[PDB]
Design a protein around this motif. Structure first.
Motif, mmCIF file in Angstrom:
data_model
loop_
_atom_site.group_PDB
_atom_site.id
_atom_site.type_symbol
_atom_site.label_atom_id
_atom_site.label_comp_id
_atom_site.label_asym_id
_atom_site.label_seq_id
_atom_site.Cartn_x
_atom_site.Cartn_y
_atom_site.Cartn_z
ATOM 1 N N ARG A 66 0.830 -1.196 0.000
ATOM 2 C CA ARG A 66 0.000 0.000 0.000
ATOM 3 C C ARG A 66 0.856 1.232 0.000
ATOM 4 O O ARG A 66 0.518 2.254 -0.564
ATOM 5 C CB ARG A 66 -0.873 0.027 1.245
ATOM 6 C CG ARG A 66 -1.656 1.301 1.421
ATOM 7 C CD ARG A 66 -1.894 1.622 2.878
ATOM 8 N NE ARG A 66 -2.866 2.691 3.044
ATOM 9 C CZ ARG A 66 -4.115 2.500 3.437
ATOM 10 N NH1 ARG A 66 -4.544 1.288 3.713
ATOM 11 N NH2 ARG A 66 -4.933 3.522 3.560
ATOM 12 N N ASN A 98 -9.159 2.118 -9.298
ATOM 13 C CA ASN A 98 -9.545 0.754 -9.022
ATOM 14 C C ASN A 98 -8.350 0.015 -8.508
ATOM 15 O O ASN A 98 -8.470 -0.924 -7.737
ATOM 16 C CB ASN A 98 -10.066 0.082 -10.284
ATOM 17 C CG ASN A 98 -11.408 0.611 -10.721
ATOM 18 O OD1 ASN A 98 -12.278 0.883 -9.908
ATOM 19 N ND2 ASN A 98 -11.585 0.757 -12.018
ATOM 20 N N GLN A 101 -6.976 -5.152 2.991
ATOM 21 C CA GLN A 101 -6.865 -4.827 4.375
ATOM 22 C C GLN A 101 -8.135 -4.375 4.984
ATOM 23 O O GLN A 101 -8.139 -4.012 6.115
ATOM 24 C CB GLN A 101 -5.813 -3.776 4.613
ATOM 25 C CG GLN A 101 -5.365 -2.994 3.455
ATOM 26 C CD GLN A 101 -4.034 -2.351 3.708
ATOM 27 O OE1 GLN A 101 -3.497 -1.639 2.889
ATOM 28 N NE2 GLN A 101 -3.491 -2.600 4.843
ATOM 29 N N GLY A 102 -9.213 -4.390 4.236
ATOM 30 C CA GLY A 102 -10.512 -4.021 4.745
ATOM 31 C C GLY A 102 -10.563 -2.589 5.212
ATOM 32 O O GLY A 102 -11.332 -2.234 6.099
ATOM 33 N N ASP A 103 -9.733 -1.755 4.612
ATOM 34 C CA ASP A 103 -9.729 -0.345 4.938
ATOM 35 C C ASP A 103 -10.738 0.380 4.074
ATOM 36 O O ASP A 103 -10.454 0.753 2.948
ATOM 37 C CB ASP A 103 -8.341 0.244 4.743
ATOM 38 C CG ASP A 103 -8.286 1.688 5.110
ATOM 39 O OD1 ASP A 103 -9.181 2.145 5.842
ATOM 40 O OD2 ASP A 103 -7.351 2.376 4.671
ATOM 41 N N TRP A 104 -11.921 0.591 4.624
ATOM 42 C CA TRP A 104 -13.022 1.141 3.867
ATOM 43 C C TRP A 104 -13.172 2.622 4.058
ATOM 44 O O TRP A 104 -13.733 3.304 3.216
ATOM 45 C CB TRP A 104 -14.309 0.463 4.273
ATOM 46 C CG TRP A 104 -14.440 0.299 5.708
ATOM 47 C CD1 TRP A 104 -13.955 -0.711 6.451
ATOM 48 C CD2 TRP A 104 -15.128 1.167 6.602
ATOM 49 N NE1 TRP A 104 -14.284 -0.534 7.764
ATOM 50 C CE2 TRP A 104 -15.012 0.616 7.880
ATOM 51 C CE3 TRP A 104 -15.832 2.356 6.440
ATOM 52 C CZ2 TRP A 104 -15.568 1.210 8.989
ATOM 53 C CZ3 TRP A 104 -16.385 2.941 7.540
ATOM 54 C CH2 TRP A 104 -16.253 2.369 8.801
ATOM 55 N N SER A 105 -12.675 3.119 5.172
ATOM 56 C CA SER A 105 -12.732 4.535 5.436
ATOM 57 C C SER A 105 -11.850 5.268 4.450
ATOM 58 O O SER A 105 -12.086 6.430 4.153
ATOM 59 C CB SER A 105 -12.298 4.812 6.865
ATOM 60 O OG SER A 105 -11.233 3.957 7.216
ATOM 61 N N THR A 106 -10.832 4.592 3.939
ATOM 62 C CA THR A 106 -9.980 5.193 2.927
ATOM 63 C C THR A 106 -10.566 4.931 1.551
ATOM 64 O O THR A 106 -10.416 5.729 0.642
ATOM 65 C CB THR A 106 -8.547 4.668 2.987
ATOM 66 O OG1 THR A 106 -8.130 4.548 4.346
ATOM 67 C CG2 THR A 106 -7.618 5.603 2.297
#
Lengths: 683, 687
Positions: free
Chosen positions: A386, A409, A418-423
């Motif tokens: 990342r 994309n 990483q399941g980072d959805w806020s980003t």
RNA sequence: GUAUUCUUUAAUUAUUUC
RNA sequence: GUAUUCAUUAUUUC
């Protein structure tokens, strides 16, 4: 021709196909008086081969179809390539009693049956063909030999036919030679194939490319040594190359081919390719060296090919090495090269590789384009760096390039891992104002950030905007995504929607569904699923079988789960999994039944499986339940006595059970924050 | 206390803004047990947040080593290696800080997983420069680093000594790592000696250990020594797992593999059979299958289906059928899985009879057909193209009392898609509609393709308009893909540009099929400008131009009457070293001359063509005549003809049609030419 | 009308036919 | 925290 007939024809070619027969009937008398053959022809020139077809079938059912009518459609059907239609005119003949056909036409039908694997019908037809006194041609012969060749074990009949054809003075051609050799090829008639070709020499006959490839193929699956050689020097490597590509896989050798080739570019590249697409790159690099070692100077396109096959094996170290030999030999890498060096199937240690490619990609000039950066982001995305993807995203823009949907994309892929959805949300929102609207992929990647984020909100927020056309992917992605969050509404919701839209669900959904029932409060729809997965003709998985046992386990019906375990033992293909063992042990433990539970642990070992932490952990729970803390304490020993390293949950489950049993100093002796749990409990 | 309330704040905040939010409640943080906050943030799976605070606190100077160590354990435990290599690179610790070994080793592994080996060794050096004593896993990680660099054997032997000199005893993880290292260099002899020496120490080896020792022999070497290991394996009593046979599979050769493991079970046999399958060596697995029987164990239906499936992908019909018979003859009665496996076969020639031969067995097998089975049968008969039998299977479905689904209507449209029979394709979709069904995307693709093979352009546009507006059909890569193609086949330039537009707009990344088609359509007109832009844009994309891309370029130059530039590419492809000019390539070049003249040049190309071997076709000659036929010359185009039948290639309709028309328009000297030998001799009459 | 390996979730009746 | 080939950041945790 006739103005009246031209009107009739136009009227026919304009009419829909499903209604046409009820139409042609209405013009029965009008049609009978005309020349169908002339109508069929006119209906064929106009490009309406399927309307003549309808007409023919109509007239046959009326008696006004003749040989010439049929012969006209057939020639049209075969040039157009509609073998099925040919075969159906033969199975539902529009011909009146007598009726003999042109040779060309019979050979088109023979080819149609052949094309359908109806070898037995072709031969019936061929016999009927020459008992009506029809002189077969070279093509008719070659078609029939082909029938014999794919029907199998018909070499004698081939000898017979070759005789018959020559005795009637029809000399064989090249379609005759290849056809025959491929027949020997399909039957392992190596010996008799060669005697054939070498008889072809005698009688004269120029050899060929297709010929040799057939012969090649014979020795292929069957000798490619002193043979394949001839093929070359006899005279050009076209399809023959591919044959080398599967020659290697059905065999096993690296010395003979080196020893052969030595004795002797595309040809070289071909053989190298054969190695690297079956996973023998070490074998190709050796071919490359040998090739270099003899005059030959590879160009950028040969390197891109080698790097390409090295790439599917993630051989980073030598890809960089090759990158070296290129630039230090003049062979300047092109765009295709870097793209090749960056399209590596991901492995461990890919980041530093990428980093080294970029280092030479920028130490050699080469102005990075926009698509170049996207390619470089995707690459660090595969690895999962990342850190380096985003540095590339930032360097990108800060250089003035405008990120596209492909760039967003990319980044979105990363965060997804990483399941980072806020980003992720920030990425999406950024892309919208830039003008870019998310596509399907962009959504699936969102669904996956959320799921690994346990964010049900963004999930159901998308399930709304979609219920965003719901594609098989999206609906399948949603079923899964809800299962990580273990959400029965969402899962079920979109489950039936996958069926109401004509999609066939894979074992994934079915498996995912079965368990969201097992561990939940539904234990019959589950049974429905395992009956549906079957009624669907699908083959259940261990996971399926394991999820199944968990159902029975949760329904307090454990022996039944033990049955499925035992039934797996015979499966001959399944074969338990400590999970299966665990799951069953977990159930018995959950029903107070613990002797039965250690009895299955005994089988487990006896069977030669291998009990584990979780396995022992289960017993400790089931022991702690009916407070019998001694047999439990004896277990943790076993784990450690065997070095299985228990889990704090193994301790907690005892601490919390030692507390509730009025035994405090016991909880203390036996034994962090846990002791604290006793203090806030004792008093 | 007041912490439980503060954690929730950070735990519930937009990540990309958390900095200024930690800046806000800053002083409440500085007095709070940072490491404590970290432990809490991880207890809720908010590890991305425990990192941001670390970096924050670190920047404030409030993070000690105890905190960093706490975040690293999670990251490693949560598999976040890049994030740890970050902490290594930025450093959120104050000067003079030292870290736990457990943490340090977590970083080393993180550096190892990124190929940052040279860096991992430098950290190891520091770790032991701080008088930290490495542990087993530490020594083992570093070994794994030595083993992936290459030329690192002495450093392995030397480190083996040290670790053993610090009273640290190697394990299975050590052994597999050292042996695997030797496997990545070709150090066969040392791997053995090491194994021998490790054994002799009383170390009981294991599966994993045995597996690496076998990759040695097999990677780049011999199948006889690796097999021997397989030998010593069982002899020891360690059962070869799945990964074992994969090595052999990737390492008359099937007869050997079975002779060893003979001095097993039904699951064993399947494990090795499937291994050879999944590699792509299936004739071997068959061979084993012959043995599993003539050796004792009798296979059931699950075992048989397994084998059938393998054959399926190879579509080995006849043997599949043999096998189905042996099943029912030896006792193994097929199941719904057996049949479905048999019909899931790969499309090919003679598949229709196969399916009939299978269905013939489904029927005689007295097995009631279900709604599902029909859908399969319709699909297979539809997949081979037996339109006739699919529909018969169809009416049989809807008559035994089953109800079609969308798949049922989709199968059917698939067939028609090959035939172009769109009229029926329509009549179907409506029926799909009158049954309470809504067409899928593939349903729209099939129908699309269905119109293409026909020539029905009005139904295409009728799809575009319904796709470029309403939501009935979303512009999916697939749908836009099926459009570039269906408009090419029908030569609708306008309708392709729109699709190439949206593809290069709806976020898609075009494929060579799309690019090339665009190249050929522009080339089929004079559209030089765009065409060349497409070609480069293929290059700027990162794809490899195949022949069809090169042939289309030459035809453009032909079309643009620059046929000399067309030959430069033919030459360029002659030395491409990777791409060999095709027959269509040469013709494309010759015609380009013949189209603008210079047929003496056309001869020039044909010459070498034959010089490069290359055996010309009819078209090759039909084209050559074109120029010689319409160029104030006839004595040549006649001489050129004697090169067809006299070389048994046989001319054709477009040919002669160019002889009469060109000669009967350049007269009498044309009549005698045609007399030298139906549909034509009315043109001469027409003239 | 015909042949030699891949192609059969198919650009392969894909690109050349004065 | 670590190793062997080429929905798994899947199914079991009283």
């Amino acid at each position: 021709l006739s103005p009246d007939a031209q009107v009739l024809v136009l009227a026919i070619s304009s009419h829909p196909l499903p209604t046409l027969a009820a139409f042609l009937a209405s013009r029965r008398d009008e049609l009978l008086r005309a020349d169908i053959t002339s109508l069929l022809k006119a209906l064929e020139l106009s490009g309406h081969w399927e309307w003549a077809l309808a007409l023919l079938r109509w007239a046959g059912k009326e008696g006004a179809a003749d040989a010439s009518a049929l012969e006209m459609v057939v020639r049209a059907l075969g040039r157009e390539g509609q073998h099925d239609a040919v075969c159906a005119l033969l199975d539902e003949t529009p011909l009146p009693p007598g009726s003999r056909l042109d040779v060309r036409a019979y050979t088109t039908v023979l080819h149609a049956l052949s094309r359908a694997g109806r070898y037995e019908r072709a031969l019936e037809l061929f016999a009927e063909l020459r008992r009506q006194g029809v002189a077969p041609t070279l093509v008719t012969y070659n078609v029939v030999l082909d029938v014999y060749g794919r029907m199998g074990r018909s070499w004698p009949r081939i000898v017979a036919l070759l005789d018959e054809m020559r005795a009637a003075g029809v000399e064989p051609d090249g379609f005759t030679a290849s056809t025959v050799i491929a027949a020997c090829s399909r039957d392992g008639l190596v010996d008799e194939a060669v005697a054939f070709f070498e008889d072809l020499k005698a009688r004269g006959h120029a050899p060929s490319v297709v010929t040799y490839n057939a012969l090649l193929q014979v020795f292929g699956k069957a000798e490619a040594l002193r043979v394949l050689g001839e093929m070359e020097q006899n005279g050009p490597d076209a399809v023959t190359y591919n044959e080398l590509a599967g020659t290697y896989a059905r065999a096993g050798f690296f010395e003979e081919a080196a020893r052969c080739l030595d004795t002797m570019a595309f040809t070289y590249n071909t053989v190298m390719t054969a190695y690297g697409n079956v996973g023998k790159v070490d074998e190709a690099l050796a071919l490359f060296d040998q090739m270099k070692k003899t005059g030959f100077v590879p160009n950028v396109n040969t390197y891109n090919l080698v790097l390409g096959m090295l790439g599917k094996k993630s051989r980073f170290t030598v890809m960089l090495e090759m990158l070296g030999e290129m630039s230090r030999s003049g062979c300047t890498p092109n765009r295709v090269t870097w793209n090749t060096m960056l399209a590596v199937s991901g492995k461990r240690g890919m980041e530093d590789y990428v980093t080294r490619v970029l280092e030479g990609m920028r130490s050699s000039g080469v102005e990075l384009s926009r698509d170049t950066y996207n390619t470089l982001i995707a690459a660090y995305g595969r690895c999962g760096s990342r850190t380096n993807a985003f540095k590339m995203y930032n360097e990108m823009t800060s250089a003035g390039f405008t990120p596209c949907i492909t760039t967003y994309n990319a980044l979105l892929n990363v965060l997804s891992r990483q399941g980072d959805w806020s980003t992720a949300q920030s990425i999406v929102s950024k892309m919208r104002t830039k003008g870019f609207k998310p596509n399907e992929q962009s959504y699936s990647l969102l669904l996956q950030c959320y799921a690994k984020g346990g964010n049900v909100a963004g999930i159901a927020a998308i399930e709304n905007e979609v219920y965003v056309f719901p594609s098989w992917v999206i609906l399948r992605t949603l079923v899964i995504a809800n299962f990580k969050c273990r959400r029965l509404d969402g899962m079920e919701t979109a489950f039936q929607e996958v069926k109401a839209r004509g999609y066939n669900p894979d074992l994934v959904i079915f498996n995912s569904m079965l368990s969201i029932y097992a561990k939940n409060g539904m234990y019959s729809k589950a049974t429905e699923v395992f009956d549906s997965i079957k009624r669907s003709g699908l083959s259940p998985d261990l996971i399926t079988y394991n999820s199944l046992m968990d159902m029975y386990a949760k329904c307090s019906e454990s022996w039944e789960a033990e049955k499925i375990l035992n039934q797996l033992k015979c499966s001959q293909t399944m074969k338990p999994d400590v999970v299966s063992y665990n799951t069953v042990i977990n159930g018995f433990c959950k029903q107070g039944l613990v002797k039965e539970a250690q009895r299955v642990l005994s089988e487990m070992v006896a069977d030669g499986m291998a009990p584990c932490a979780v396995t022992y952990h289960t017993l400790v729970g089931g022991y702690s339940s009916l407070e019998m803390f001694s047999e439990a304490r004896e277990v943790i020993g076993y784990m450690v006595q065997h070095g299985l390293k228990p889990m704090e949950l193994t301790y907690r489950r005892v601490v919390e059970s030692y507390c509730r049993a009025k035994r405090f100093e016991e909880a203390r002796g036996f034994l962090k924050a846990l002791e604290a749990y006793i203090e806030d409990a004792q008093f």
